RNA sequence: GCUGAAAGCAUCUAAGCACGAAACUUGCCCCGAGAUGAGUUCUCCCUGACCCUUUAAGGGUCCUGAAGGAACGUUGAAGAC
RNA sequence: GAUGUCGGCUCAUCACAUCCUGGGGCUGAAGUAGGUCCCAAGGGUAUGGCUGUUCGCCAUUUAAAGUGGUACGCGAGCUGG
RNA sequence: GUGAAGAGGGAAACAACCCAGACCGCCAGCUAAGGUCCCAAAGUCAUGGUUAAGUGGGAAACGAUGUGGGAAGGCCCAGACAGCCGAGUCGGCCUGCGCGGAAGAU
């Protein structure tokens, strides 16, 4: 259920959520899967700042 | 006609053509020699 | 292709008009209309047409060959004309004609009639000849063969309806 | 805590309008059975409808690749012996020309009562005019 | 073209000069009075209703009663619907008679069967009967087998069994017209046609 | 079968056009809106006052009882009931 | 610590490798009648003498008297040769 | 070697096949076999080719100018191959993917 939710709300940002994890992943960010589906359910704002994050990393 | 796994040319005014996926002998000479493959 | 590099001529007295794919050609006697296929360019320089395949198809000139053949005929169709020769073999066959219609005796228990289309005509010199006269190649070939099957040549005589410079086999019994 | 649930009671919903000229049949059917079910929401809960309305037009304009129009044949039977019977593409098209996309997108929907609640915010014409002007429908290119 | 609604009389023979009995059934066809005219752009489809008959007035409902009253018509027994085709028109109204049938030869005739209650394989569907000697033992008119086996292990739908027989809708297609009496409100067919005495039925010209 | 290239000829086919069977879809007869996707058309009937609270598709008292239906009786060429 | 079995009667349902009717190609096919192969499952496809017989022989009919699967269909439906 | 005496994931359902040996609790993470359009978790990812048969998603001897790749030969601007003038034409060998042979009973 987490890992549904989470590709939804990167799919609205404008990446798939195989790219997010490995962009987090190059940018060292340590959160897990439950609190990521959280942050997109209840603060969006914090959920565009983390995508940048990992289009940075990405890049 | 002559139905059969085998068609072939069987004299000097035989030709061989394909149609709508099927290969046909067909002769100007001698009506014997009309074949179809099937 | 080696059919298809051959432009075709445009004779004084006749016209033509191309848009897109559609293309009209008027003469001393009738129009014609036709579409191409989509995937020849024909270009008008300036007395002749010429024929080529565009870019993104795998059969260009094969369509171009066809193309320059169809064109071909239209021309020569639209000054010249085109005729067919029919002849009756048989005791007590006979032809006739009224306005666009033909009327067959063919040894049958009830009468014949045929109805022509638009642009073609006919006329009987004799009681066992039919003559036909029209602009259009398919057209013409089409209502020979439509009357040509009320009765086809038999190989033991001979009888029926047969085209003027045909070779019809026989057989002994 | 405790992981987020939606409630039926309060779920937002839209209108949506689409066209089907000359677009393929099963890559239509994928986009509208996902927005049905509403797997393009954070929101999403297996258990809730949590979809949107979607209308089609110009249903009898769909489009097929390599020889289908004249190939591909539905079947069904009458629960009589003997009753198997058949119809064919261009039939099918000529006679009912919504039930393609009907069955379509029926064939890719869960099975059981929450489907069969969600296949009932779809509506499929076979035109260009609907009698929805009061609802507000939004353009959606697919 | 449109039909009319009549009242089955009996059965009677008619002689001709040459000595041919011919069978006859006597119609009683009165006066269709047009109730209603249905077009394409309120219904659909284009047809007419008519009534014929009467009604005692401390049997009519009020709904009934203000149907008929918008058109202008007393109160029959029943409603009709007829479909219109292209190029024929009526008016509400209007009363249409038994010279209707003038020129007609042939007609199809539409009623209801007598009824037979509760019937059997034998006469239901004409099934044959076993042996009643022989050393059989209490199966004389039953039907005997309805199935094979374990493949399929059930039985089809649509086998013939007993039950109800009769009173149902049915009609006979193509009888001769003998007569048309228009003073007397008659028409005469050759043959017989579904029902018992005093029943409803539509005539209609042939189809075929 | 007609017109026609790939393959300068030929070819019923690759682009186009025409025929062809008691088999398929209709035309004939019967059922059919529980078709939960529960459809359409015509006609008929109902036009009173108060209270309470946790205030809402809320509960109660008095006055009123239409259109129509059912029940009972005499019954049917309708029926096991 | 039980799955009743040969033929016959009553009642059927499916496949097509087609007995009749429908549409075609070749013939050492003049006509009438024939031989062989391709398409086609809508409908229809005997009564008697002998024998427990399925078969089979015989007498007289018919457009024709098809070949197979269904616990070698069918005994909580019949008979018991 | 496994089952017998062995649970979990995959092969649609499938003791004996592939991965892997369950002391108890967790709304943490990484991988194996197998997979990433919808039923149903994850690429409608990137570059270069082949197939037109729904081949992919049943089956042989044999038959055929289907369509890609390769190494060699014969004849020809001295005019060749086709038909009645002007640029090529003929037939064998090896090889990749497809087409016919292909008829059954709710």
Redesign the pocket.
């Known amino acids: 259920l987490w ?2 939710r989470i ?1 939804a709300a990167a799919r609205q940002n404008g990446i ?3 790219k997010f994890i490995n962009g987090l992943k190059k940018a060292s960010v340590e959160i ?3 609190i990521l589906a959280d942050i997109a359910v209840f603060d969006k704002v914090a959920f565009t700042a983390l995508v940048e994050k990992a289009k940075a990393a990405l890049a | ?1 002559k ?1 059969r ?4 040319k069987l004299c000097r005014n035989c ?7 099927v ?1 046909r002998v067909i002769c100007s000479a001698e ?2 020699h ?1 074949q179809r ?2 | ?3 298809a590099k051959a432009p075709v001529v445009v004779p004084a007295g006749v016209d033509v008009k191309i848009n897109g794919q559609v293309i009209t050609i008027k003469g001393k006697n009738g129009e014609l209309t036709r579409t191409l ?1 989509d995937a020849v360019e024909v270009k008008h320089a300036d007395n002749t047409l010429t024929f080529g395949p565009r870019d993104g198809y795998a ?1 260009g ?3 171009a ?2 193309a320059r ?2 064109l071909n ?1 239209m021309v020569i169709g639209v000054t010249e004309g085109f005729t067919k020769k029919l002849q009756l073999v048989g005791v007590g066959y006979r032809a006739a004609v009224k306005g666009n219609v033909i009327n067959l005796s063919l040894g049958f228990s009830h009468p014949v009639d045929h109805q022509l289309p638009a642009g073609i005509t006919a006329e009987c010199p004799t009681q066992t000849e039919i003559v036909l006269k029209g602009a259009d ?2 057209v013409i ?2 209502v020979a ?1 439509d009357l040509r099957a009320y009765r086809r040549p038999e ?2 005589k001979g009888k029926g309806v047969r085209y003027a410079d045909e070779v019809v086999r026989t ?1 002994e ?1 | 805590m ?2 987020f649930t939606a409630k039926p009671e309060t779920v937002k919903r839209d209108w949506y309008v689409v066209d089907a000229t000359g677009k393929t049949l ?2 239509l059917a ?1 986009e509208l ?2 927005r049905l ?1 509403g ?1 393009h929401k954070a929101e999403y809960t297996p258990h809730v409808d949590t979809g949107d309305y979607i209308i089609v037009l110009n249903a009898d304009k769909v489009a097929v ?4 129009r004249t190939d591909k044949v539905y079947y069904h039977h009458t629960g009589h ?2 009753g198997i ?1 058949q119809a064919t593409f261009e039939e099918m098209i000529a006679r009912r020309p ?1 039930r393609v996309i ?1 069955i379509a997108v029926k064939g ?4 059981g009562p929450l489907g069969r609640a969600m296949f ?1 915010k779809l509506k499929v014409y076979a035109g260009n005019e609907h009698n929805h002007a009061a609802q507000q429908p939004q353009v959606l290119d697919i | 073209m449109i039909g009319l609604v009549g009242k089955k009389v009996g059965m009677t023979r008619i002689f001709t000069e040459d000595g041919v009995s011919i069978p006859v059934t006597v119609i009683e066809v009165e006066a269709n009075r047009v109730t ?1 005219v ?1 077009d394409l752009a ?3 489809y284009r047809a007419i209703q008519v009534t014929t008959g009467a009604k005692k007035a401390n049997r009519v ?3 009934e ?3 008929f009253a ?1 058109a202008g018509v007393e109160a029959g027994r029943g409603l009709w619907e007829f479909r219109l085709a292209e190029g024929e028109e009526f008016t509400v109204g209007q009363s249409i008679s038994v010279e209707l049938f003038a020129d007609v030869k042939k007609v199809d005739v ?1 009623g209801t069967s ?5 019937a059997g394989t034998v006469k239901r569907w004409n ?2 009967t ?2 009643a000697t ?4 209490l ?1 004389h008119r ?12 059930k039985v ?1 739908k649509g086998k ?1 069994m007993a039950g ?1 027989m ?6 006979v ?1 193509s009888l001769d017209v003998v007569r048309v009496d228009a003073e007397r409100n008659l028409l005469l067919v050759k043959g017989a046609v579904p029902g ?3 029943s409803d039925l539509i005539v209609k010209p042939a ?1 075929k």
């Open positions: 890992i549904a590709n798939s959520y195989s897990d899967r439950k | 006609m139905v796994a085998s068609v072939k030709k061989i053509v394909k149609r709508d996926g290969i009506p014997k009309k493959q099937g | 292709s080696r059919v296929n059969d000139w094969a369509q060959g066809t053949a169809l005929s190649k398919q070939g089409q063969a190989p033991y057989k019994a | 405790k992981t099963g890559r994928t059975a996902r079910r797997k690749t390599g020889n289908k012996i003997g019977k919504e009907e890719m929907l869960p099975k009932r | 209603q249905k309120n219904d659909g409902t009020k709904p009663a203000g149907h918008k539409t007598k009824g037979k209650g509760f099934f044959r076993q042996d022989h050393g059989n033992s199966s039953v039907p005997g087998s309805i199935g094979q086996n374990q493949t399929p292990g089809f013939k109800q009769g009173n149902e809708r049915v009609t297609q018992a005495t005093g189809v």
